[PDB]
């Protein structure tokens, strides 16, 4: 059993919309720090404060505090505000105290759980820089070539100081997910002032630009990609207890054989508004179901050739997402319609995958009948499209 350590009202800055929203927050001794639209009447690692760095600031609002987290390879920040500096002090103190208690118990246990783990490869010059893939608040993602092997990777280069809080996340390659369609970490190293993550880069091209070229995917082809995405998100949800939050078509790549890769290239933005779930827009509470919304948008895009909700004006886009009922092309069939309307329920509690069953609900949906999920996981499904690359070093889809 987990104990509420401290609870109360806080103003929370929106993570996409940047208004201030009063929310009722519980800090628990397992490290969870979670906000609610109302004091709940009765656990995702996304909400953990363990391993955080705590900042006190006075901009844009007085008495604000920032929790900053490295989650896998991405820096995440949550910003809060209270009325009085005395209140801020009690909150930051409770948060620190909970975390310290987590560190102190982890290290005692692992100190005894040590079995010739008491033993004592790569640097920047090993790599050729090729292409900026993204920039963000605290770093950048670049396409590199490993000079010794000719192999291509994405390298994520982050400012060491925003992550580490006077001490110091290097054996992370040992915590790799055992899932084929997630992006695996190959190396992680640090420089004097940077922390670098070298991760796989699929060379079968961007699904965004395969879909653009082809206009639409058949229901069978979208079934294939959807099944692979579902397998990966099921793994994240149930083996890692984390939500992705970032499912969009541009984050989907194909490997040389045609299997999905979900990318891990996100950097801090302190946008793609068309993929945001309604509860994320309203900064209501969110959990595993936000990923099933994204699945719904991505597969609507695959089978219909356009977004379920779009407007060039972001404000009417948000209203469409929040308010408008989904329309389908007339040539779409009823198993696809049922899946998509279920994944795009606006109420996360009514959405397919939004119950205790999580991904099993989707896995059991009519649209996926006949899919052998063990074969999906094992890459025994035969891809409907093989990209035009010779080996894992044919740069067809970059150059």
């Amino acid at each position, epitope marked *: 059993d987990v104990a509420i350590v401290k609870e109360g009202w806080l103003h929370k800055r929106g993570e996409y919309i940047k208004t201030w929203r009063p929310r009722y927050f519980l800090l628990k001794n397992d490290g969870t720090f979670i906000g609610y639209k109302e004091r709940p009447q009765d656990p995702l690692n996304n909400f953990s404060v363990a391993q955080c760095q705590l900042m006190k600031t006075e901009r844009p609002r007085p008495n604000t505090f920032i929790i900053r987290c490295l989650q896998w390879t991405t820096v995440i920040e949550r910003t809060f505000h209270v009325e009085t500096p005395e209140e801020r002090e009690e909150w930051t103190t409770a948060i620190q105290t909970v975390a310290d208690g987590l560190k102190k118990q982890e290290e*005692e246990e692992m*100190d*005894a759980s*040590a079995e*010739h783990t008491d033993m*004592e490869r790569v640097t920047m010059n090993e790599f050729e820089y090729l292409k900026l893939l993204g920039k963000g608040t605290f770093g950048k993602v670049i396409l590199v070539k490993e000079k010794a092997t000719g192999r291509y990777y994405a390298m994520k280069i982050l400012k060491k100081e925003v992550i580490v809080a006077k001490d110091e996340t290097e*054996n992370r390659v040992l915590q790799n997910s055992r899932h084929p369609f997630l992006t695996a970490l190959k190396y992680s190293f640090q420089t004097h002032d940077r922390l670098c993550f070298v991760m796989e880069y699929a060379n079968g091209g961007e699904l965004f630009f395969h879909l653009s070229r082809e206009r639409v995917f058949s229901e069978d082809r979208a079934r294939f990609y959807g099944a692979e995405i579902v397998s990966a998100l099921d793994y994240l949800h149930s083996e890692k207890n984390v939500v992705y939050r970032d499912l969009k078509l541009e984050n989907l790549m194909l490997d040389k054989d045609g299997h999905i890769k979900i990318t891990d290239f996100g950097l801090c933005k302190e946008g793609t508004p068309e993929y945001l779930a309604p509860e994320v827009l309203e900064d209501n509470d969110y959990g595993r179901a936000v990923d099933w919304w994204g699945l719904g948008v991505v597969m609507y895009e695959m089978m219909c050739g356009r977004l379920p909700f779009y407007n060039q004006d972001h404000e009417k886009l948000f209203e469409l997402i929040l308010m408008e009922e989904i329309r389908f092309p007339r040539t779409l069939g009823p198993e696809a319609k049922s899946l998509l309307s279920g994944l795009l329920k606006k109420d996360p509690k009514q959405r397919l995958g939004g119950g205790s069953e999580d991904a099993k609900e989707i896995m059991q949906h009519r649209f996926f009948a006949g899919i052998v999920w063990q074969h999906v996981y094992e890459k025994k499904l035969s891809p409907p499209f093989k990209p035009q690359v010779t080996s894992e070093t044919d740069t067809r889809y970059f150059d």
Partner: nanobody
Amino acid sequence: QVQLQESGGGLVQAGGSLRLSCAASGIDVRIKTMAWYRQAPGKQRELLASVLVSGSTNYADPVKGRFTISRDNAKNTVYLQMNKLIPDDTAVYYCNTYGRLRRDVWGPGTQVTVS
């Protein structure tokens, strides 16, 4: 002052013997896998011996039979007993727990030179 402290070093003649002692101040060696290390003027730091919480011991090849790792829970101290010493054993010796090891935290070490 939470810290690990090594002593017992000095000059020894090859084929000699020495007992190194690691005095823990603010830590409990009972609850922690303890280990011994050494580092020579150009080499990497070397895992030498570890004593599990159970008392199980294990050694790296260059040392088995010759050195013995021992925990003494009553004194909160660990020991390296070094016998049949070799010039290639000359180095600075450290003792550590798992947590301090991965955070690169070290006591002062003790120098052992043999020829």
